[PDB]
Amino acid sequence: TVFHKRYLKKIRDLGEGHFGKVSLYCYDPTNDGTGEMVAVKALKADAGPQHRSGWKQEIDILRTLYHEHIIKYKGCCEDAGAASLQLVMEYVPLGSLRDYLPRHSIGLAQLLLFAQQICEGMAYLHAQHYIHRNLAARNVLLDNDRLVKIGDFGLAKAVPEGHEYYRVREDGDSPVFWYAPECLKEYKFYYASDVWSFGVTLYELLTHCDSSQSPPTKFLELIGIAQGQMTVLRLTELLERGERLPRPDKCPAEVYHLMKNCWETEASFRPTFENLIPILKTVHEKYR
Numbered sequence: 001t002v003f004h005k006r007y008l009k010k011i012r013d014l015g016e017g018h019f020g021k022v023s024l025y026c027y028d029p030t031n032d033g034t035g036e037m038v039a040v041k042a043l044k045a046d047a048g049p050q051h052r053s054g055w056k057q058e059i060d061i062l063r064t065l066y067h068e069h070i071i072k073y074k075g076c077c078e079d080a081g082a083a084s085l086q087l088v089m090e091y092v093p094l095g096s097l098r099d100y101l102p103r104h105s106i107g108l109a110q111l112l113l114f115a116q117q118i119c120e121g122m123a124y125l126h127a128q129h130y131i132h133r134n135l136a137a138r139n140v141l142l143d144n145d146r147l148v149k150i151g152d153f154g155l156a157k158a159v160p161e162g163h164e165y166y167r168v169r170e171d172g173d174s175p176v177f178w179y180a181p182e183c184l185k186e187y188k189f190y191y192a193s194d195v196w197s198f199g200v201t202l203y204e205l206l207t208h209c210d211s212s213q214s215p216p217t218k219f220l221e222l223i224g225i226a227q228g229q230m231t232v233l234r235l236t237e238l239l240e241r242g243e244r245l246p247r248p249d250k251c252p253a254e255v256y257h258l259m260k261n262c263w264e265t266e267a268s269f270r271p272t273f274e275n276l277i278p279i280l281k282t283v284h285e286k287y288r
């Protein structure tokens with residue numbers, strides 16, 4: 001599917017993705033204003049060959065993904081400037097949960113439904129032999145009060161059929177506070193590593209994405225802000241000692257134990273996304 005730059009009418013900037021920026025456009029070829037609203041992710045004009053290789057990979061992954069809980073791929077636009085492809089995706093009306101939740105007091109049952117939907121989209125992603133590597137509330141988008149979709153796949157990678165993990169590099173932009181100990185220490189990203197990130201995401205939902213309760217805030221309170229290059233090493237140490245993010249206010253005990261099960265040190269002791277779907281359906285049923 002092809003989109004024309006001449007028919008794209010910019011409304012506002014939505015935010016910063018991974019390789020570039022996301023903007024809100026109205027694709028209006030008729031010029032009457034009845035055109036559809038699109039979210040266009042563009043690669044920055046000054047990006048090197050390393051980011052351009054990863055950007056093409058992001059588009060290839062999104063194109064091959066088709067799920068109700070994964071952001072819909074609409075097409076691509078011919079970007080004459082920067083000489084790259086602009087990723088055209090569906091506009092999710094309510095936005096990220098990190099922005100929506102601190103302003104809208106959402107019930108426990110609805111939060112548990114979102115977690116179930118995240119697991120539904122993630123199990124499909126894993127069945128397609130892909131890892132997300134960036135599962136967080138800022139990347140989970142809301143369509144309506146009952147529908148959730150996974151948005152940013154900038155760090156998503158394909159795990160080969162034979163292998164069970166993917167070896168990662170030493171990067172500054174890595175969401176370390178959402179990462180399992182095997183990602184920080186051995187630089188290995190398993191399917192079980194995404195489950196750890198879900199637990200951290202579930203923690204964010206229960207806190208209603210309160211920035212003073214966020215994982216970088218709580219972990220740096222335990223690490224300390226003056227530890228040189230040893231922030232990640234100190235983070236690895238406390239996780240090895242069994243220290244975890246605290247139980248959120250008004251969060252049920254069994255739900256916190258499920259969060260702690262997603263946060264098991266040994267990756268094999270962690271439930272798969274397919275294991276979490278019947279569980280979260282039952283948990284949501286109890287609180288609805």
Ligand SMILES: N#Cc1cc(Cl)c(C(=O)Nc2ccnc(NC(=O)[C@H]3C[C@H]3F)c2)c(Cl)c1
Nearest residue numbers: 014015016022039092093094095139151152
């Ligand atoms: N970090 C990060 C980060 C930054 C951005 Cl921009 C995105 C993203 O793709 N956001 C989108 C995409 C489509 N619609 C909205 N919808 C809205 O923004 C609705 C509020 C109204 F504009 C937000 C993601 Cl998934 C992660």
